[PDB]
Design a protein around this nucleic acid. Structure first.
Ligand SMILES: [Mg+2]
Ligand SMILES: [Mg+2]
Ligand SMILES: [Mg+2]
Ligand SMILES: [Mg+2]
Ligand SMILES: [Mg+2]
Ligand SMILES: [Mg+2]
Ligand SMILES: [Mg+2]
Ligand SMILES: [Mg+2]
Ligand SMILES: [Mg+2]
Ligand SMILES: [Mg+2]
Ligand SMILES: [Mg+2]
Ligand SMILES: [Mg+2]
Ligand SMILES: [Mg+2]
Ligand SMILES: [Mg+2]
Ligand SMILES: [Mg+2]
Ligand SMILES: [Mg+2]
Ligand SMILES: [Mg+2]
Ligand SMILES: [Mg+2]
Ligand SMILES: [Mg+2]
Ligand SMILES: [Mg+2]
Ligand SMILES: [Mg+2]
Lengths: 63, 67, 60, 80, 206, 55, 70, 141, 143, 145
RNA sequence: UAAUUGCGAUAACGAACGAGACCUUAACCUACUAAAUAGUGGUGCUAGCAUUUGCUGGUUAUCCACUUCUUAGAGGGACUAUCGGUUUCAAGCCGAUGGAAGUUUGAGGCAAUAACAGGUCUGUGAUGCCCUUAGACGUUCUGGGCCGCACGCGCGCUACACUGACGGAGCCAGCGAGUCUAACCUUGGCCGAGAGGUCUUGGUAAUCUUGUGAAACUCCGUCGUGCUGGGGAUAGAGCAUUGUAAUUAUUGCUCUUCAACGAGGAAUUCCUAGUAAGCGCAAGUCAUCAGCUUGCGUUGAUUACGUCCCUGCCCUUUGUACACACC
């Protein structure tokens, strides 16, 4: 099973009608240079570390 | 929220307007200044004021302020 | 502090708003060692609408 | 002898709520026009050096359905 | 350890372990580490404590909740289901007890097995109901470290509580048991099943 | 009297249990009017002369 | 009504030979050896302490903890 | 007399007064030795300052505490406060500063509000519910 | 060093003192003990049966040693607890004024407590004596 | 306390007072399955019979058991107050009894009937299968009979 | 921004009501003025254990001194301060340090203009008109009734146990209240299993009840998963209290009798920190009766620090033949 480590950078905001969801851009630590935006379920600030279970499929707006 | 009502902001204006020599970047003395230099009816309203008239003061130093 | 806690309504209708009146009682005492004269001089005058003065004597 | 009564006129009735209420009562019982009654009561209190005054008349006059009126002049404050 | 005694005497082992190391009930904070990346920061351990009771203001600000010593975080979460609401003294004792049991079994800093089980039972990603139009499908997300710690605590505790319910075995054992099994997950713990079944469904929608 | 009360068949729990329950026992509030609150029913009316003398 | 509440001789023996390899020995443990009920198990704990196999690592009511002697 | 200071500790309601005079290392709470002080699960909450700042230190002093009010927890958190405050007051007048600041540095660096009392307090309930925030159940119909 | 009972934890003191009075024989036990209940806020009698009257008296002693004067009223309340009013909310309830008042009469006959001025019962001068003894005994149990 | 042994000396289930009693239950509580005897009564009767309460029902020597029953039906000779007794002042011979076992069934009946047979309101209320001690019967108790 | 709270934009400029201010309460003062109705240290008089000085108690004035703790007067304190991020470098917002305190400091009191056929003539010797007024719808006296029970709805209490029940043991609050022409709050001593009784007693009260020794909770035991010792409905028999009166059982005690309930369908309530929840207390009512309420302290969390999806409201825009205003 591949694992993937990404450092959160810059809180972009809340999506999801309810609002519990939070869009953030992250940076990989296993070779940086590339960043990707993710949707989160819990509370998040800058410099957190997210286990991307699959390192390549970013999302956008939630309903 | 901590938005100062007009009465505080109004009064700070009036005081910086005509006591810029005297007055300081220091609240503590701006406080005491307010006593001699203006009647106010409550200790709370005075610091509320003097704190803000210090704020306005502290950033006139770094350029003008409209009003 | 004498509290009285009551419904505002004369009747029953409405959300049940409760309201507590209060009356504060302040009591002092000053102990004096003085002759018969000053005592009465000090009791009769120094009076005031609102303050209840009580003078007791006694060893006990 | 343990009880003693002393009457004593008041300094300017024109700043005594109770004074002016009872005046209207009386005014209105000699049947002055509603507004004439109250409007003078305002304009005397004012004269007696008040910083604001205000009168309400609620209830029923001549018509069947109940009404109410504000009569006010000068400055009031209402809170705290 | 340079002995010292005054008027009202202070107990041997008490002088002995305290003044030296600042360790737990009588367990070691040092060594103990968060074996998964992240979770560091969002799991305490150091500063070290004696027992897990504290008048801690971990509430009045958003994230400071993180700073609470994770052993005592665990304990707080032990004291619920209305009948046990409050009752920290009751709880704390279970942990002291629990940690002893965890210890007896498979050696190891018991305070570290706690660390393993927590790290090991929080969902790395999850689902959330999305508008989509009435028939609201399931959109996947990656979950916060904080959220991931919290769920681990709550999951761990619950599974034991329900194990403890209606049976001879005590809170402390089932809690110890739940943990020990959750150290490196073993499909028999209420939490791992729930983690795994949660990531089953999370991966079931992307 | 009391003699009758116990001797009286047609009474006591068994008997009520063995009876169906009225439907009036599960009604609503009944309301009956409230939708006419602002429409005065006196059938009078005041009038601008009599109001103007009053006020 | 489902067996636990006594001392059946062949049981006592089992409570002597079966207890080694018990890495953990508590109240719950003893009932779980398809045998004694809590009461005449709590008595066992103090009596295996008479001499051997169990060291008292933890104390009190509700919770007991013993391990294999060394 | 002898060199001494008096200090206090307050948590919730509980007020723990302490007398810290010069003596031979005595520490008794309410009349009994500190090695008792049950609840006891929390015992180390009150052993805590001693260990924090070196088991010695108390050799030139005595300590008594008197806790009234509060309850079976708020008194423990209160007495420890008065104990460690007590020790710092003593150096403040009798020993020296750098030795005072030494102590206050470890009491702070650890802290469970050991020198400074906790501000928290009950909030008054208000009519309509059994709690300060809680409102009674309602029904619409 | 020298020793006061205050220098011993409750369950270490009283259980040593309770054992003392039982090991001794001078006491006065009521007789209704074994059929009585300790309080109307209770459900079953004491399980110590042969005993427990020693244990209260031992506790009663130590309490009255720890203070100026106290009487039945206070001890009734001290030993009172919750009474399950069945389906209704609990309230505190006072315990039995007999078991206590008779313990007071007992401990006094054996000279560990005396009637007191200002009211109540004061710790005896021979109570001090004999209590600080066994205190110094179970401190010696950890010698 | 003790680790005991016993030969085949203890039997499971044993029958006294026309009812059955489980063997491996502590003898105080074991006794309660008998109608009319509750925990307080059981407890005292045993203390009086000089039995070791630590024991289960089955252990008890047949002598000890026989003794026990004997006190249960003559509580007042064998020194047990009276305020311990379910039927003080027998409203006819006015003695003080402790109705037991099968008898408590019959003496409930006898009482219920004395009321009914005298037409007293309580009786009537019993015959109507209602609540008697004056409880609102609007809301509570509806499944029931 | 909690706020028509401000910044800013600007045919507007500059103000007042309401918001804020204000007031009350809870937090900080070893700074000020004091206290035998609050308390500390010393000293006598004195008990106990040690003795080497010690340790732990007793003593409404045997004396001296103080005000830390308690009390309440006068002041002081905080102004989101300093610093740093972010922002139209604007009002602001966020983070760190410090601080008794930095969510409007926390919680309240006050509260403009206007609306409703809201509720109250059953609070009033407030009141119009109507009805009735001696075989009364006046009033009082005797007895019953508001409690009645196939059943539907709402608020509640207690539980379905082992984070427990039971038994012994530890043993800690705060807000309160109490008797004059009177029988209120009750200590202590006896008697009683208990409820209670009896004899005295302190208090018009920071003085006495009362340290309200409260309950959860803490400890050592017993029971061991069995409707069990969880649970305590229903019911019999006896004692006692309030009251002129207790039957349709006022309440309290005792033995016995030992139900439903094995965590609850669709639905739905409340809540963000000393808060939720658990726990008891005082006060109102009150002769007697709290499963209710108003407050109070004790133990003390999990989870947000978001959004407009549901629901409710407010705002512009927009339509009107409505203005008694969609009833
Ligand atoms: Mg204003
Ligand atoms: Mg205001
Ligand atoms: Mg409960
Ligand atoms: Mg108690
Ligand atoms: Mg008790
Ligand atoms: Mg029975
Ligand atoms: Mg009823
Ligand atoms: Mg002071
Ligand atoms: Mg800080
Ligand atoms: Mg209407
Ligand atoms: Mg009215
Ligand atoms: Mg009614
Ligand atoms: Mg309601
Ligand atoms: Mg208990
Ligand atoms: Mg008798
Ligand atoms: Mg008198
Ligand atoms: Mg049962
Ligand atoms: Mg029960
Ligand atoms: Mg009451
Ligand atoms: Mg009511
Ligand atoms: Mg238009």
């Amino acid at each position: 099973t591949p694992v993937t480590l990404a450092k959160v950078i810059k809180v972009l905001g809340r999506t999801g009608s309810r609002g519990g969801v939070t869009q953030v851009r992250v940076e990989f630590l296993e070779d940086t240079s590339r960043t990707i935006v993710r949707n989160v379920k819990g509370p998040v600030r800058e410099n957190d570390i997210l286990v991307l279970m699959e390192s390549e499929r970013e999302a956008r707006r939630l309903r | 929220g901590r938005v100062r009502t007009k009465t505080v902001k109004r009064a700070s204006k009036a005081l910086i307007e005509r006591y810029y020599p005297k007055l300081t970047l220091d609240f503590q003395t701006n406080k005491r200044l307010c006593d001699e230099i203006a009647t106010i009816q409550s200790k709370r309203l005075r610091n509320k004021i003097a704190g803000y008239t210090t704020h306005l003061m502290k950033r006139i130093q770094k350029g003008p302020v409209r009003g | 502090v004498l509290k009285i806690s009551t419904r505002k309504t004369p009747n029953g209708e409405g959300s049940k708003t409760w309201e507590t009146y209060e009356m504060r009682i302040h009591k002092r005492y000053i102990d004096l060692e003085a002759p018969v004269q000053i005592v009465k001089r000090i009791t009769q005058i120094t009076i005031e609408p609102g303050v209840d003065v009580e003078v007791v004597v006694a060893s006990n | 002898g343990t009880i003693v009564l002393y009457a004593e006129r008041v300094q300017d009735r024109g700043l005594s709520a109770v004074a002016q209420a009872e005046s209207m009562k009386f005014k209105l019982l000699n049947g002055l026009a509603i507004r004439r009654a109250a409007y003078g009561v305002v304009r005397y209190v004012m004269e007696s050096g008040a910083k604001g005054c205000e009168v309400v008349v609620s209830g029923k006059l001549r018509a069947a359905r109940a009404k109410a009126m504000k009569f006010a002049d000068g400055f009031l404050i209402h809170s705290g | 350890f340079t002995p010292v005694v005054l008027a009202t005497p202070i107990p041997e082992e008490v002088q002995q372990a305290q003044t030296e190391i600042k360790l737990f009930n009588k367990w070691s904070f040092e060594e103990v580490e968060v074996k998964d990346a992240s979770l560091v920061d969002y799991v305490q351990v150091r500063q070290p404590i004696f027992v897990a009771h504290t008048a801690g203001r971990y509430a009045n600000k958003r994230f400071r909740k993180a700073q609470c010593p994770i052993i005592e975080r665990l304990t707080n979460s032990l004291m619920m289901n209305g009948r046990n609401n409050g009752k920290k003294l009751k709880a704390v004792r279970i942990i002291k007890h629990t940690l002893d049991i965890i210890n007896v079994l498979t050696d190891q800093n018991p305070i570290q097995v706690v660390v393993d089980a927590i790290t090991n039972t929080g969902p790395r990603e999850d689902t959330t109901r999305v508008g989509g139009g009435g028939a609201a499908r399931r959109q996947a997300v990656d979950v916060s470290p904080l959220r991931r710690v919290n769920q681990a605590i709550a999951l761990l505790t619950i599974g034991a509580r329900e194990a403890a319910f209606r049976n001879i075995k005590t809170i402390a054992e089932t809690l110890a048991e739940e943990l020990i099994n959750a150290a490196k997950g073993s499909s028999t713990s209420y939490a791992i099943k729930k983690k795994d079944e949660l990531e089953r469904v999370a991966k079931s929608n992307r | 009297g009391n003699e009758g009360a116990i001797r009286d068949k047609t009474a006591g729990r068994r008997n009520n249990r063995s009876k169906d329950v009225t439907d009036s026992a599960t009604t609503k509030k009944s309301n009956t009017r409230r939708a006419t609150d602002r429409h005065s029913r006196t059938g009078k009316t005041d009038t601008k002369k009599k109001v103007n003398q009053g006020w | 009504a489902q067996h636990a509440v006594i001392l059946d001789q062949e049981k006592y023996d089992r409570i002597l030979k079966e207890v080694p390899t018990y890495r953990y020995v508590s109240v719950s443990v003893l009932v779980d050896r398809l045998k004694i009920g809590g009461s005449l198990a709590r008595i066992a704990l103090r009596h295996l302490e008479k001499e051997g196999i169990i060291k008292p690592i933890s104390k009190h009511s509700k919770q007991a903890i013993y391990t294999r002697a060394t | 007399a002898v060199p001494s200071v008096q200090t206090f500790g307050k948590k919730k309601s509980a007020t723990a007064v302490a007398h810290v005079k010069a003596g031979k290392g005595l520490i008794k709470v309410n009349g009994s030795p500190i090695t008792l002080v049950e609840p006891e699960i929390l015992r180390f909450k009150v052993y805590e300052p001693l260990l924090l700042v070196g088991l010695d230190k108390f050799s030139n002093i005595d300590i008594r505490v008197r806790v009234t009010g509060g309850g079976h927890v708020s008194q423990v958190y209160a007495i420890r406060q008065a104990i460690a405050k007590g020790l710092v007051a003593y150096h403040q007048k009798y020993v020296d500063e750098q030795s005072k600041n030494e102590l206050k540095k470890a009491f702070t660096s650890y802290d469970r509000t050991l020198l400074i009392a906790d501000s928290r307090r009950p909030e008054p309930k208000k009519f309509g519910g059994k709690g300060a925030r809680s409102r009674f159940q309602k029904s619409y119909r | 060093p020298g020793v006061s009972v205050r220098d011993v934890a409750a369950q270490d003191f009283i259980n040593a003192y309770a054992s003392f009075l039982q090991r001794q024989g001078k006491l006065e036990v009521p007789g209704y003990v074994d059929i009585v209940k300790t309080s109307s806020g209770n459900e079953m009698p004491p399980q110590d049966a042969e005993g427990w009257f020693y244990k209260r008296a031992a506790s009663v002693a130590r309490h009255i040693y720890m203070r100026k004067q106290v009487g039945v009223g206070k001890l009734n309340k001290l030993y009172g607890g919750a009474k399950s009013r069945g389906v209704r909310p609990y309230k505190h309830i006072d315990a039995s004024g007999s078991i206590n008042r008779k313990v007071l009469q007992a401990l006094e006959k054996i000279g560990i407590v005396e009637i007191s001025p200002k009211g109540g019962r004061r710790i005896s001068e021979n109570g001090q004596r004999d209590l600080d003894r066994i205190a110094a005994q179970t401190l010696e149990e950890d010698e | 306390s003790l680790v005991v042994q016993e030969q085949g000396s203890f039997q499971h289930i044993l029958r006294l007072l026309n009812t059955n009693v489980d063997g491996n239950i502590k003898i105080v509580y074991a006794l309660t399955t008998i109608k009319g005897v509750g925990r307080r009564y059981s407890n005292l009767v045993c203390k009086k019979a000089d039995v070791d309460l630590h024991k289960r029902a089955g252990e008890l020597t047949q002598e000890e058991l026989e003794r026990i029953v004997q006190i249960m039906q003559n509580p007042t000779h064998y020194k047990i107050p009276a305020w311990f007794l379910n039927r003080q002042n027998d409203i006819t011979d006015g003695k003080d009894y402790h109705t037991l076992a099968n008898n408590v069934e019959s003496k409930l009946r006898d009482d219920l009937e004395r009321l009914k047979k005298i037409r007293a309101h309580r009786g009537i209320r019993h015959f109507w299968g209602l609540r008697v001690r004056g409880q609102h019967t609007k809301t509570t108790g509806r499944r029931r009979a």
